[PDB]
Amino acid sequence: IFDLVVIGAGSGGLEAAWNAATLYKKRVAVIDVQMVHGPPFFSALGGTCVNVGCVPKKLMVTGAQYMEHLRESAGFGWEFDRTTLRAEWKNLIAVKDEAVLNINKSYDEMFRDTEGLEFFLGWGSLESKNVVNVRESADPASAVKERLETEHILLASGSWPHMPNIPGIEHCISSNEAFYLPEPPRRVLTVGGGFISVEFAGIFNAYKPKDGQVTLCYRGEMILRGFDHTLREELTKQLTANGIQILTKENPAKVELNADGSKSVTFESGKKMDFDLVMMAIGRSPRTKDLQLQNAGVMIKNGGVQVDEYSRTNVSNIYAIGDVTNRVMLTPVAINEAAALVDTVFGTTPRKTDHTRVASAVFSIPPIGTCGLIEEVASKRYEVVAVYLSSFTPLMHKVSGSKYKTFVAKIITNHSDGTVLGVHLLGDNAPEIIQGIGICLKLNAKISDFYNTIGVHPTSAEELCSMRTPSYYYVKGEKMEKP
Amino acid sequence: KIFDLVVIGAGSGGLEAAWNAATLYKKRVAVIDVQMVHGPPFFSALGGTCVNVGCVPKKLMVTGAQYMEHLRESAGFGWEFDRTTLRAEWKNLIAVKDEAVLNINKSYDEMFRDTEGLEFFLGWGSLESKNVVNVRESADPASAVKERLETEHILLASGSWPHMPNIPGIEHCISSNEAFYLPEPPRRVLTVGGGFISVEFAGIFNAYKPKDGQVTLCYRGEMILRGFDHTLREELTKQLTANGIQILTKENPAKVELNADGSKSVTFESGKKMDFDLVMMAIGRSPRTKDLQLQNAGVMIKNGGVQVDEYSRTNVSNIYAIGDVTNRVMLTPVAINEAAALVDTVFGTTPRKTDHTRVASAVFSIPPIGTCGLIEEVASKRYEVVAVYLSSFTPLMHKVSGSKYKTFVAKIITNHSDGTVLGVHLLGDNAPEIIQGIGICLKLNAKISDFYNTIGVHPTSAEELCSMRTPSYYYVKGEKMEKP
Ligand SMILES: Cc1cc2nc3c(=O)[nH]c(=O)nc-3n(C[C@H](O)[C@H](O)[C@H](O)COP(=O)(O)OP(=O)(O)OC[C@H]3O[C@@H](n4cnc5c(N)ncnc54)[C@H](O)[C@@H]3O)c2cc1C
Ligand SMILES: Cc1cc2nc3c(=O)[nH]c(=O)nc-3n(C[C@H](O)[C@H](O)[C@H](O)COP(=O)(O)OP(=O)(O)OC[C@H]3O[C@@H](n4cnc5c(N)ncnc54)[C@H](O)[C@@H]3O)c2cc1C
Numbered sequence: 026i027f028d029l030v031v032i033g034a035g036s037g038g039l040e041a042a043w044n045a046a047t048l049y050k051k052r053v054a055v056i057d058v059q060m061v062h063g064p065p066f067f068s069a070l071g072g073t074c075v076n077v078g079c080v081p082k083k084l085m086v087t088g089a090q091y092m093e094h095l096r097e098s099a100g101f102g103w104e105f106d107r108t109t110l111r112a113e114w115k116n117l118i119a120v121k122d123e124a125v126l127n128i129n130k131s132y133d134e135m136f137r138d139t140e141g142l143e144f145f146l147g148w149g150s151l152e153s154k155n156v157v158n159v160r161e162s163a164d165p166a167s168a169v170k171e172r173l174e175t176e177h178i179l180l181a182s183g184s185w186p187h188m189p190n191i192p193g194i195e196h197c198i199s200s201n202e203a204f205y206l207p208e209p210p211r212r213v214l215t216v217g218g219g220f221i222s223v224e225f226a227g228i229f230n231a232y233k234p235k236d237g238q239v240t241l242c243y244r245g246e247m248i249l250r251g252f253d254h255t256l257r258e259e260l261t262k263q264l265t266a267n268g269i270q271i272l273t274k275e276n277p278a279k280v281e282l283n284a285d286g287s288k289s290v291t292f293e294s295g296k297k298m299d300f301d302l303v304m305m306a307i308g309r310s311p312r313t314k315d316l317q318l319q320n321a322g323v324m325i326k327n328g329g330v331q332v333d334e335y336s337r338t339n340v341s342n343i344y345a346i347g348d349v350t351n352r353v354m355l356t357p358v359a360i361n362e363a364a365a366l367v368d369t370v371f372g373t374t375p376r377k378t379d380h381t382r383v384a385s386a387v388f389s390i391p392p393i394g395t396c397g398l399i400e401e402v403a404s405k406r407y408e409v410v411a412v413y414l415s416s417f418t419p420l421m422h423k424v425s426g427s428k429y430k431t432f433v434a435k436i437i438t439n440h441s442d443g444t445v446l447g448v449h450l451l452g453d454n455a456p457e458i459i460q461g462i463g464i465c466l467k468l469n470a471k472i473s474d475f476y477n478t479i480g481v482h483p484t485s486a487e488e489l490c491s492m493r494t495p496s497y498y499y500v501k502g503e504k505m506e507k508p
Numbered sequence: 509k510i511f512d513l514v515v516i517g518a519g520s521g522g523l524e525a526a527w528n529a530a531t532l533y534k535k536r537v538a539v540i541d542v543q544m545v546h547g548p549p550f551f552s553a554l555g556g557t558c559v560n561v562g563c564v565p566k567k568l569m570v571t572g573a574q575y576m577e578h579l580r581e582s583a584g585f586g587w588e589f590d591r592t593t594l595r596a597e598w599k600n601l602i603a604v605k606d607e608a609v610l611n612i613n614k615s616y617d618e619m620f621r622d623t624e625g626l627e628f629f630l631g632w633g634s635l636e637s638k639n640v641v642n643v644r645e646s647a648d649p650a651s652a653v654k655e656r657l658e659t660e661h662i663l664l665a666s667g668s669w670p671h672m673p674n675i676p677g678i679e680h681c682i683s684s685n686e687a688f689y690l691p692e693p694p695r696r697v698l699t700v701g702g703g704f705i706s707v708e709f710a711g712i713f714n715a716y717k718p719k720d721g722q723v724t725l726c727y728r729g730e731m732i733l734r735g736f737d738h739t740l741r742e743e744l745t746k747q748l749t750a751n752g753i754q755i756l757t758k759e760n761p762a763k764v765e766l767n768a769d770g771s772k773s774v775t776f777e778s779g780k781k782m783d784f785d786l787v788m789m790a791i792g793r794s795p796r797t798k799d800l801q802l803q804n805a806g807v808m809i810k811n812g813g814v815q816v817d818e819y820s821r822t823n824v825s826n827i828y829a830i831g832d833v834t835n836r837v838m839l840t841p842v843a844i845n846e847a848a849a850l851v852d853t854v855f856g857t858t859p860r861k862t863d864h865t866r867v868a869s870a871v872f873s874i875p876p877i878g879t880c881g882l883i884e885e886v887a888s889k890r891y892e893v894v895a896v897y898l899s900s901f902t903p904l905m906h907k908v909s910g911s912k913y914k915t916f917v918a919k920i921i922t923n924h925s926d927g928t929v930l931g932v933h934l935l936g937d938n939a940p941e942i943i944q945g946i947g948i949c950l951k952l953n954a955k956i957s958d959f960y961n962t963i964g965v966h967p968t969s970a971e972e973l974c975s976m977r978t979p980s981y982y983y984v985k986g987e988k989m990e991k992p
């Protein structure tokens with residue numbers, strides 16, 4: 026009774042549905058647990074990107090950024106009664122919710138006006154390799170409310186925050202709750218070295234009350250593992266200078282709820298500290314358990330649904346795309362996988378996604394933009410690697426008072442042929458700059474293609490077109506220099 | 509010939525050429541300029557237009573003008589303060605602008621000291637013969653020689669200057685030069701010109717204008733920004749308008765009179781009459797050739813500028829010309845490039861020229877514009893089949909910031925026959941930054957599919973560029989077609 030059934034109406038899911046019903050005229054059934062955003066399930070029609078990810082965080086970071094402009098405006102002749110300055114977390118949340126709602130709504134209207142596309146509210150799971158059930162709850166015992174029969178099934182259940190098993194985790198929240206806080210914490214602790222943690226620390230630091238304080242902790246050596254070491258270093262000094270406290274090598278042992286309502290946190294090191302909020306952002310895991318995978322023999326690899334380059338599971342006719350497959354957890358990748366999938370299944374040509382050289386950003390303050398390999402991986406796959414590095418304080422920061430705001434541009438190449446392996450930036454507008462550069466690496470651009478390009482002046486980006494001599498090299502993993 | 513090279517002008521092209529000749533080629537270089545530090549009376553100095561009355565100062569100033577937007581839009585995200593206490597101190601802006609510029613002028617001087625084979629000469633430069641350059645105390649060829657320089661090669665890099673039209677009253681008007689030194693922001697100002705200088709300054713004035721100030725922009729043609737994509741010209745016009753700037757198209761000043769209160773009365777050919785406290789003319793720049801005494805060497809002048817060939821050579825051996833003076837592409841980076849190419853061509857093993865095609869550039873208007881390649885109108889005349897891909901949207905933040913008129917426009921033009929990208933034009937915040945990597949793309953002969961097969965960075969405005977798959981319309985032998 027259905028060609029395709031997607032479990033999850035997220036970015037991948039919707040993309041796969043839409044495409045199937047429009048370019049292939051297939052009867053598509055789509056399942057999600059909520060129509061509009063917010064608790065109790067947080068996610069809804071639209072997925073993480075829409076309800077508790079990309080969209081709302083960008084609105085908030087944009088909000089958090091105003092603290093910089095309002096401070097920096099002074100250096101260019103802008104005055105006002107700074108003592109009357111206050112941030113209304115409630116407004117932020119209020120507008121955030123309207124915006125999200127309008128999108129949940131817009132999505133609903135979509136199913137209406139689209140033929141062959143039907144939406145089904147409830148939890149979905151596999152009965153058999155061709156039977157998908159919509160129940161009223163995550164409990165496989167709860168009441169079936171629909172029994173869908175189909176030839177093809179696509180899994181797109183996304184991921185979910187991972188809460189560690191430490192005593193008192195019940196006193197902490199994940200990123201989900203954070204988008205609904207009724208008031209901004211005075212003292213907040215964000216746990217995690219990753220983007221989510223970093224981004225939120227930026228947000229909380231801006232809308233924090235009078236003697237508020239944001240503390241970020243990580244179990245490792247320095248934040249943002251997996252990113253260029255120069256950015257991790259620079260980002261830490263900048264976040265620090267903005268008044269954010271970063272604890273490295275610290276890992277929460279237990280959280281206890283004091284009488285005033287505060288939370289006492291005890292770190293394995295023995296340190297004790299109080300906080301009004303404890304946000305855990307240590308990881309996201311594919312949401313597989315509730316799918317009853319066993320009822321069809323679909324394999325699971327590292328918590329996620331195993332697939333092959335074509336997004337196919339081990340059971341013909343059962344495909345998986347997105348966060349659920351644990352490859353690259355970025356919205357655009359999901360959307361891209363879905364389209365490739367759909368073509369490969371109901372079209373004339375099989376097509377897969379290129380998970381390499383994907384540009385991405387971190388919306389911290391200041392932000393980061395990146396594409397390709399970090400040196401440390403590069404020197405392991407190539408014998409001769411050249412590193413081009415640039416660091417400078419943009420003019421505007423010279424005059425805005427934010428002298429600590431250094432812009433960092435780093436280019437990494439395979440010295441044998443000039444090919445560009447990775448470009449990493451730190452500084453205002455980075456996310457925006459990295460995009461075309463993403464196209465550059467798909468075109469196998471080489472360093473000379475950059476420096477032979479005429480710069481746009483004056484801009485930060487033009488730095489990328491003026492790096493001609495490497496600062497250092499890696500010869501079979503060893504660091505060398507030119508005498 | 510006590511000098512290998514003599515550069516007249518210490519701007520972007522000249523400095524780059526000087527530096528490269530003395531450092532990579534160990535040549536004795538002489539460089540001349542009329543002032544060491546910015547400001548009146550000559551405005552330009554060591555550093556050139558980019559440093560003293562161009563790129564640098566205009567970016568600082570536009571940067572300042574943007575705060576008006578952020579200050580207004582902050583309200584949308586929960587930022588409150590006593591808006592009635594809000595004021596702009598033009599004098600502060602000018603104060604920090606001067607310190608920044610001064611520091612660079614100083615950094616430049618120091619460079620001449622620490623660099624061997626590089627010598628700086630203060631004064632007006634001119635040719636005596638094809639191998640003799642004179643430094644005089646004034647622009648007048650009669651003034652006192654203060655130095656006689658013999659050399660084997662001469663580089664002309666005098667740049668351009670504002671062009672004041674010969675209309676009655678021009679003496680009551682000013683140019684972009686004086687604008688950087690205004691002691692007070694005009695209450696009613698009129699900027700004359702449709703170009704970038706006029707548009708960029710309109711936004712500056714509009715942000716630091718007093719209480720019931722008013723900025724008026726007039727252009728004699730149909731719509732601002734001639735030479736740029738029609739969609740951007742239209743959009744930009746609505747957006748400037750919605751911010752309180754008044755734009756008069758099809759108006760052409762006839763005369764300016766100085767009233768007794770000190771205001772300036774402006775009479776347009778059309779007969780209209782309006783009063784202003786400031787009249788800024790920004791109708792163009794001309795290569796500075798007259799004071800060089802080109803005749804003493806036979807160097808040819810084409811359209812107001814020094815004639816040169818692809819290798820930047822004049823008609824007289826050993827006399828080269830790079831930069832604004834040659835009237836090709838008046839951008840800082842183009843000048844810098846021509847100089848390096850020139851220097852390699854003359855004192856190096858290999859001849860090299862600059863590619864004046866596909867050069868990215870921007871207009872620091874509010875919002876700004878970023879562009880690269882051909883505009884449809886020119887495309888449809890060189891190619892039989894042209895596809896125009898067009899996107900328009902109000903970014904998320906502008907939905908919530910209260911600036912709903914700030915639409916983002918992305919436009920991609922291609923040669924439909926093979927998919928090659930001919931031009932990319934953007935309008936919206938951060939466009940200038942977005943266009944750069946895009947400039948690299950067209951140097952690599954990218955094609956529309958290379959864009960859309962790229963995974964986007966989300967969420968950002970730039971990502972739109974990677975998601976335009978179907979053309980909105982085409983140009984078939986200049987006619988506009990569409991798919992039924
Ligand atoms: C705080 C945060 C910020 C982020 N910011 C960015 C960013 O700036 N840029 C970026 O590229 N990425 C960002 N991401 C990641 C990006 O959102 C994800 O990579 C992407 O949404 C994954 O999409 P998906 O379709 O695979 O999953 P989803 O959008 O996660 O969709 C999964 C859907 O499945 C539903 N579902 C679950 N199981 C069932 C079931 N059994 N029955 C019915 N429905 C079910 C869920 O309710 C959900 O709606 C962010 C993520 C987070 C958490
Ligand atoms: C208001 C404004 C804004 C601009 N903004 C930008 C921008 O944002 N981006 C961009 O790319 N471009 C911009 N430009 C243009 C850019 O500044 C020029 O294209 C570039 O400076 C030209 O460099 P040049 O070396 O050829 O000229 P210059 O820097 O103009 O050098 C000419 C020098 O020669 C000296 N000179 C003149 N004749 C003599 C003589 N006879 N003897 C001795 N010395 C002499 C002068 O004093 C001057 O310092 C802008 C221009 C203006 C006017």
Ligand SMILES: *CCN(CCCl)CCC[C@H](C)/N=c1/c2ccc(Cl)cc2[nH]c2ccc(OC)cc12
Nearest residue numbers: 035036039040074075079131132135356360975
């Ligand atoms: C997470 C934010 N979105 C990205 C740009 Cl819309 C959602 C992506 C999912 C998928 C691409 N959805 C859409 C939608 C969904 C719903 C409506 Cl009402 C309109 C949409 N328009 C889209 C336009 C272009 C897309 O390609 C990236 C995707 C769209």
Ligand SMILES: *CCN(CCCl)CCC[C@H](C)/N=c1/c2ccc(Cl)cc2[nH]c2ccc(OC)cc12
Nearest residue numbers: 491519520523524558559563615616619840844
């Ligand atoms: C107009 C703004 N500048 C561009 C980047 Cl510095 C001036 C460009 C002119 C020429 C390229 N000059 C320089 C200088 C000049 C003086 C000093 Cl003290 C340092 C410079 N450093 C440069 C570094 C890199 C350049 O390549 C674009 C140019 C430089």
Ligand SMILES: *CCN(CC*)CCC[C@H](C)/N=c1\c2ccc(Cl)cc2[nH]c2ccc(OC)cc12
Nearest residue numbers: 039040041043044131132134135136137138139
């Ligand atoms: C009433 C009709 N609309 C709702 C208001 C339906 C929404 C249609 C838009 C066009 N949706 C999508 C897309 C449009 C255009 C392109 Cl090129 C791609 C595209 N992809 C998706 C993918 C998923 C999806 O689900 C919401 C919608 C669209």
Ligand SMILES: *CCN(CC*)CCC[C@H](C)/N=c1\c2ccc(Cl)cc2[nH]c2ccc(OC)cc12
Nearest residue numbers: 523524525527528615616618619620621622623
């Ligand atoms: C005391 C030594 N310095 C002054 C403080 C001299 C300035 C040297 C810098 C490096 N100047 C220039 C350049 C540096 C590096 C590169 Cl790769 C290029 C380069 N080009 C130019 C061109 C012109 C110029 O004149 C000011 C300087 C530099």
